[PDB]
């Protein structure tokens, strides 16, 4: 009540007049609310949500009023905005004037003496804030401050000898160094002092860290504030090191400080519990300090370059050894001396003083003055020299030794596998997705690990649930008191194969095992377990139960102690055995015992064996007593990890014009078609334009010149310059024969000039990105691009990748209405057929088979029409012979006569009159009849072209081989989901799958790595990628890829699509700007979010969009819903949010509409929480029930599950009364505002959402109308704007509505009677 | 804990070496040793 009253008085939104700025408010809030509550998250949230930063803190900030409390408060707010994933920097961008002063004083505060003016926690907050800054260099205001901290001049923080070493190593650097020193002369004394302080900041910050770290005791109690400071510091180090602009010069600085050696010898890492997170962060930092990249060129280092670097280090150490100390070491070959073991052997016996001296000769430490003792520990000195010179394994070898399954040592580690309870207050040992990556390996590995660790979370839930249900009890044996659908007791387990390693690798190439279960279960469960197939992943589990028989289990309690969890290992089904011992017209097995042969992870196997042999650890693989299966659709993690690893191993040949953009650096526009060197001058736009008028209107800024003046002669070809002039050439589609129905289908969509820009771009080489707001015609743009590419570049193959099968259904539906032969279409998938034709491998093989029959019959008819005898039927083979021998000959003779010249001789010598009798010449002009004859030959030739393509079905009997032919050769358009593409990449590459162009839909719904993988479904061609075009269509202003555990979004931004990253990076986009599915009035609720999003003509002009909704005054309303029986939002189960007042009101409105005669199916009900969804459903069944007058809404579901869907009328419940929740994500808002064609009615606590700054552009519109539902119960042909010719009653709350609907219904039950049975 | 003959508190059926748990009605007439010595084959 204190913070809120202050907000109301001084800064809260929607309060006309506020008290003037008062510095004491900032001082009081910081000391008494923030500091005293120990930086309580709920306090900080309340302040942030109340718009403290935007409305009080920053706009009143100046140098004269700046204080500790002021600085800290700003940083707390910024940090909290990051924790909540809302824009953090907007107010600074609005008033940038005092930010440089503010930033400099954040630096001073961060370096302030430990435990001095600023507490260690306060300086941790500053560490995190600065981390956000370094992670935000895309913001000009921030970058302009950070530049001086991380540029070449920062090297004045280096030891003088190390600086000179670097300048000698890269001689071209010295002139730039000199230039800096010169420009420094031109500075006034204070600007010079400020510059030097900024240049030294990071190196000085490192020293502060090192002293904090050293203050941590080995075993004595330690304050958590020291631990967390050290953790956040390493997080900062990682991010600086993992970004090239911050790494470029700082990497040397970090090395010069020897921080990493300090950290690995520290007491903190030695604390098994306290320092565990610190250790894991440390391992990440080590990965980056030794990362395989050239700091200056930014290029990845080759294996040769790595080896040279390592060899040069040893060489210079031997030079120093020979001249000044280690004689035998200096003369030995590198391989002799460069192992950790050898280095310890050679330098371990030496004194501290000698090691210090050695290090000094390598410019690692200052000279040890004569007769002085070193102040450094011998273990530091030794580890310094050893770690610097020892052999390193490469990043690839490191990756190739990783098991693909999580063990029990990983699954419950919440540092790397956080629960959904993760607040965001501590940090995690996780990769982060933002804008840039160092190299392709960095990029691929971050996605590998994030996918790996996120999938591990779902595994834990699967394990904890199924194993708990089994109720493992002590009997020293185990007895299971319960049963589980997804997990069975193991009856037997035996490793049956341990194969020899490939040359080089130290792990078996293959490990297999037999696992037996006893299906003493319900037949439904027996069937599901027998439903296991090859590549299905199962988990092998060892429990040694802790509880006596009958002991109750508590899911709230630590799972591992509850069931006695000892081991978890993964495996992959090879197949079930049959009674002949064969790995599986599937047989009917007898009895209830089933054995599966499985693959074990060979790396995990070797590690376990090594552990057993070396350390006497028990053999894990003799202990398994539970096997757990999973839902197939949620269980692709292993296959995806494998594919990513394979991609990493390969040379990853992506187009050279894509590589830099993919990594997020370099010119974001360099793949635009206008900058591609192979830009095509002349394009056939075919049926894109409906008329010459449509064409001219499609290029507003251009001058159109037609190659033909006659308006009656005006498909179109367009030539683009290399200057605002377009040359348009009309041309004639080649006659396809004497059957006018064989004229091609044509596009009917009058594309806007913006849609045309997208289509134009998609036809050109390079990267085309299309931002398509709700209903702006993404699909029509897509198929037109596909069609244009199909006709312009017949040889080229197009790969289509979407997120959902729904999008594929939509694409193929529209493709069918265009001039595209269905023999060139193919759809891959692992499904309910929703299109008029079947484009699966099965459907396409069947089409070919049926079409082959019909065409061979045409050849027979042709044979007979020519008077050629022969009763045998044709094959594709003999049809080919027939074409060359009987058809081509006749045609060539004919052309020889009439094309080498009367109208009459065109018809008189035409060799195929009888064949086309069922269908010729007009006798008007030669040119016309000749072309008619030409078209007849094209008709016949097409028959034989198809038969030649179909010969493969005569050479390949099985449907699988036949489908392979379509995939590798016949199809020109191949479509699949990104999911399928990830699973099938290995098979596709092995098949020799090839493609030239990629088009994607739903691009902003697709995970980063699942966007990248479709780039590599083929092998390189002559050393280069065959990929010519990349078209991505999506909407980053709508919902992102789904991350099951939102902790991975909060910390790592794992939901961020490649599409979204590219938009952020600055890749130019084509922004579709005219929607065609909803009222203009409804469009206003979300078009504010987009660039110039208006409406198409038919939305503006058709009556169906201006007709009001019967019985409701407004076509949309926001309806305030106060408490019902003292309750607002409720939570019958944790996080199962509901709102009875809102639910009842929504259902009552739905009933009202049904009783008015609304088509119940045209109404869908949406809400932001699953808890409310089930409750609305509950009320639907319990209030409507067996009511004849009331139907069911098409759907009752969540907004997140209604993406890409719509209905005429949407009833929306926002549920929340205490906190705004995940609707604060504007993308969720936009989706919620755009599901309705004609009617949107929203029920919420209006005050709560009004206060949310991010939601203001929508809710300021919604509150422009009454918050009490306006009904017209005696009502349609009433128009949207006209005053109604009925009574308007105002329902002021839910109970009044539920009353009204009851009375209305009881009046309708007496006056009517309908009859369904 | 043992669950085998090899190895009151147990609250288990345990039969430690060979006390029969199922009906046999065996013919054999018990072999006997007297005091210190002999299997009484007489």
């Amino acid at each position: 009540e204190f913070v809120t009253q202050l907000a109301c008085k001084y800064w809260a939104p929607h309060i006309k007049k506020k008290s003037p700025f008062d510095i004491k408010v900032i001082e009081d809030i910081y000391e008494k609310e923030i500091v005293k509550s120990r930086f309580a998250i709920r306090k900080i949230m309340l302040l942030e949500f109340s718009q403290y930063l935007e409305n009080y803190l920053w706009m009143n900030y100046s140098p004269e009023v700046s204080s500790k409390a002021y600085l800290m408060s700003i940083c707390c707010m910024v940090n909290e905005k990051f924790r909540e994933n809302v824009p953090a920097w907007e107010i600074f961008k609005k008033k940038p004037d005092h930010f440089p002063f503010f930033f400099k004083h954040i630096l001073k505060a961060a370096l302030a003496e430990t435990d001095g003016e600023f507490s260690l926690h306060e300086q941790t907050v500053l560490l995190l804030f600065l981390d956000h800054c370094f992670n935000s260099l895309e913001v000009d205001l921030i970058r302009s401050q950070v530049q001086q901290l991380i540029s070449l001049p920062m090297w004045m923080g280096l030891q003088l000898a190390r600086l000179e070493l670097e300048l000698k190593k890269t001689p071209k650097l010295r002139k730039f160094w000199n230039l800096i020193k010169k420009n420094d002369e031109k500075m006034d004394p204070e600007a010079r002092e400020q510059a030097y302080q900024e240049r030294r900041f990071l190196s000085q910050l490192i020293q502060k860290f090192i002293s904090v770290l050293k203050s941590v005791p080995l075993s004595e109690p330690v304050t958590m504030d020291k631990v967390h400071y050290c953790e956040r510091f390493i997080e900062l180090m990682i991010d600086l090191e993992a970004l090239l602009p911050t790494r470029r010069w700082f990497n040397t600085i970090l090395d010069d400080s020897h921080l990493l050696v300090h950290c690995y010898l520290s007491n903190l890492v030695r604390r098994e519990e306290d320092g565990h997170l610190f250790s894991q962060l440390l391992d990440m930092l080590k990965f980056y300090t030794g990362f395989e990249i050239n700091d200056q060129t930014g290029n990845a280092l080759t294996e040769n370059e790595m080896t040279t670097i390592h060899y040069d280090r040893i060489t210079s150490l031997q030079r120093a050894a020979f001249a000044h100390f280690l004689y035998d070491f200096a003369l030995s070959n590198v391989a002799e001396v460069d192992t950790r073991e050898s280095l310890v052997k050679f330098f371990g016996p030496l004194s501290s003083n000698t090691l210090h001296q050695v290090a000094s000769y390598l410019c690692l430490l200052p000279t040890l003055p004569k007769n002085e003792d070193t102040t450094f520990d011998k273990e530091f000195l030794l580890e310094l020299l050893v770690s610097r010179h020892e052999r390193r394994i490469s990043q690839i070898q490191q990756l190739n030794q990783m098991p693909l399954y999580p063990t029990e040592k990983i699954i419950w580690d919440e540092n790397i596998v956080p629960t959904e309870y993760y607040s965001g207050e501590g940090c995690l040992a996780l990769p982060k997705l933002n804008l840039q990556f160092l190299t392709l390996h960095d990029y691929l590995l971050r996605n590998f690990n994030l996918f790996r660790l996120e999938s591990t979370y779902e595994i834990r839930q699967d394990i904890e649930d199924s194993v708990s249900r089994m109720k493992p009890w002590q009997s020293g044996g185990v007895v299971f008191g319960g049963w589980a659908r997804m997990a069975q007791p193991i009856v037997a387990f035996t490793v049956v194969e341990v194969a020899k390693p490939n040359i080089g690798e130290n792990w078996p190439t293959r490990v297999r095992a037999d696992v037996t279960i006893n299906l003493n279960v319900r037949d439904h469960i027996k069937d599901e377990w027998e439903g296991l197939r090859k590549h299905d992943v199962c988990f092998l589990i060892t429990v040694r139960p802790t509880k006596p028989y009958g002991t109750k289990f508590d899911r709230r309690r630590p799972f591992i102690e509850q069931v006695g969890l000892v081991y978890v290992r993964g495996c992959e089904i090879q197949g079930m055995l049959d009674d002949k011992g064969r790995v599986i017209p599937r047989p009917n097995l007898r009895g209830e015992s089933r054995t599966f042969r499985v693959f074990l992870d060979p790396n995990q196997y070797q590690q376990d064996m090594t552990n057993t042999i070396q350390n006497g650890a028990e053999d894990v693989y003799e202990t398994f007593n539970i096997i757990m299966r999973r839902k197939p659709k949620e269980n692709n993690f292993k296959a995806v990890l494998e594919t990513i690893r394979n991609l990493m191993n390969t040379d990853c040949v992506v187009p050279d014009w894509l590589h830099d953009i993919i990594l997020g650096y370099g010119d974001p526009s360099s793949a635009h078609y206008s900058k591609m060197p192979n830009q095509i001058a002349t394009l056939d736009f075919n049926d894109t334009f409906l008329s010459i008028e449509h064409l001219k209107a499609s290029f507003p800024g251009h001058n159109v010149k037609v190659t033909v003046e006659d308006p009656a002669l005006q498909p179109f070809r367009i030539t683009f310059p290399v200057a605002k002039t377009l040359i348009v050439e009309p041309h004639v589609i080649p006659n396809r024969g004497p059957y006018p129905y064989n004229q091609p289908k044509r596009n009917t969509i009058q594309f806007t000039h913006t849609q045309i820009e997208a289509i134009r771009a998609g036809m050109q080489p390079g990267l085309t990105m299309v931002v398509g707001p709700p209903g702006t015609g993404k699909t029509d743009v897509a198929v037109q691009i596909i069609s244009n590419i199909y006709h312009n570049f017949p040889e080229q193959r197009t790969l289509i990748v979407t997120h959902s099968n729904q999008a594929l259904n939509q694409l193929f539906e529209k493709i069918m209405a265009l001039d595209i032969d269905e023999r060139h279409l193919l759809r891959l998938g692992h499904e309910e057929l929703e299109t008029e034709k079947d484009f699966s491998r099965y459907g396409r093989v069947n089409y070919v088979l049926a079409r082959r029959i019909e065409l061979l019959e045409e050849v027979k008819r042709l044979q007979k029409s020519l008077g050629v005898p022969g009763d045998a039927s044709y094959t594709c083979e003999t049809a080919g012979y027939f074409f060359l021998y009987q058809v081509m000959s006749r045609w060539e003779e004919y052309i020889s006569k009439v094309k080498n010249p009367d109208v009459t001789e065109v018809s008189t010598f035409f060799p195929f009159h009888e064949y086309f009798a069922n269908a010729i010449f007009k006798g008007r002009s030669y040119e016309e009849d000749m072309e008619i004859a030409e078209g007849c030959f094209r008709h016949i030739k097409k028959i034989f072209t198809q038969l030649e393509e179909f010969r493969a079905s005569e050479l390949l009997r099985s449907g699988l081989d036949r489908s392979k032919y379509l995939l590798v050769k016949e199809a020109k358009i191949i479509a699949m989901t990104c999911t399928h593409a990830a699973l099938k990449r290995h098979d596709l590459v092995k098949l020799g799958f090839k493609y030239d162009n990629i088009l994607m839909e739903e691009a902003a719904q697709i995970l980063e790595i699942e966007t990248f993988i479709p780039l590599l479904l083929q092998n390189p061609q002559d050393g280069f990628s065959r990929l010519k075009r990349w078209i991505m269509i999506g909407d980053h202003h709508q919902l992102p890829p789904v991350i099951k555990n939102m902790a991975f979004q909060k910390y790592s931004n794992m939901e961020q699509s490649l599409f979204t990253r590219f938009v952020r990076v600055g890749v130019p986009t084509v922004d579709l700007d005219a929607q065609g599915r909803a009222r203009a009035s409804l469009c206003n609720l979300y078009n504010w979010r987009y660039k110039n999003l208006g409406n198409l003509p038919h939305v503006q002009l058709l009556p169906e969009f201006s007709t009001a909704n019967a019985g409701l005054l407004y076509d949309f309303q926001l309806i305030n819903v106060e408490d019902f029986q003292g309750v607002g939002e409720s939570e019958p189960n944790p996080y199962f949010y509901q709102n009875l007042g809102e639910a009842e009101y929504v259902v009552a409105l739905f009933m009202y509409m049904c009783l008015l005669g609304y088509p119940a199916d045209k109404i869908s009900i949406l809400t932001t929480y699953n808890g409310q969804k089930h409750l609305i459903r509950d009320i639907i069944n319990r209030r409507c029930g067996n009511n004849p007058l009331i139907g069911r809404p098409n759907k009752v579901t969540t907004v997140d599950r209604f993406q890409g869907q719509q209905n005429d009328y949407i009833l929306l419940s926002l549920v929340r009364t205490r906190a705004v929740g995940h609707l604060r994500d504007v993308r969720r808002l936009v989706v919620a505002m755009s599901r309705a064609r004609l009617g949107l009615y929203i029920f919420a606590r209006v005050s709560l959402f009004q206060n949310c700054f991010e939601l203001t552009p929508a809710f300021s519109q919604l509150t422009a109308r009454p918050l009490h539902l306006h009904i017209i119960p005696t009502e349609t042909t009433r128009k949207n704007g006209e005053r109604p010719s009925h009574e308007v009653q105002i329902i002021k709350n839910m109970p009044q509505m539920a009353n009204f609907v009851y009375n209305m219904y009881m009046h309708l039950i007496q006056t009517t009677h309908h009859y369904h049975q | 804990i043992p669950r085998l003959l090899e190895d009151p508190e147990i609250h288990v059926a345990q039969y430690p070496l060979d006390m029969g748990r199922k009906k046999k009605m065996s013919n054999a007439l018990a072999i006997q040793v007297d005091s210190e010595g002999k299997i009484k084959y007489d």
Binding site: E303, N304, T307, S332, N333, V334, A335, E336, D338, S394, K500, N502, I503, G504, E505 | -
Partner: protein, 122 residues
Amino acid sequence: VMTVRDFTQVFDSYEESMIAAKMETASEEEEDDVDLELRLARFELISRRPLLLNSVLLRQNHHVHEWHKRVALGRPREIINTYTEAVQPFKATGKPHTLWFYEDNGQLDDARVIATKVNFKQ
């Protein structure tokens, strides 16, 4: 397999041919290991050390130091030839030259052959 042999000859005519040859050796012989070592002498280093580790595990017997010598292209590979000698003659000296009498080396080879021991002494 004859097509694989002719294709192996095509690889012998030659990077892709080197891939076909290395695959031909890794397909899973000591003479063939000498051939793959010759491929290391031609094509292309740590991976060669790994395949050399495979050849070493396959047979710990005296040309292996020469296989290690390709990695030197040498003092380190000679050191591997020396450690291999400890694991077991002139090859270590050749490794020393790489870091940089044949008749006595030959009587030594007679010693290297798998009263006879007295001859080994002489």
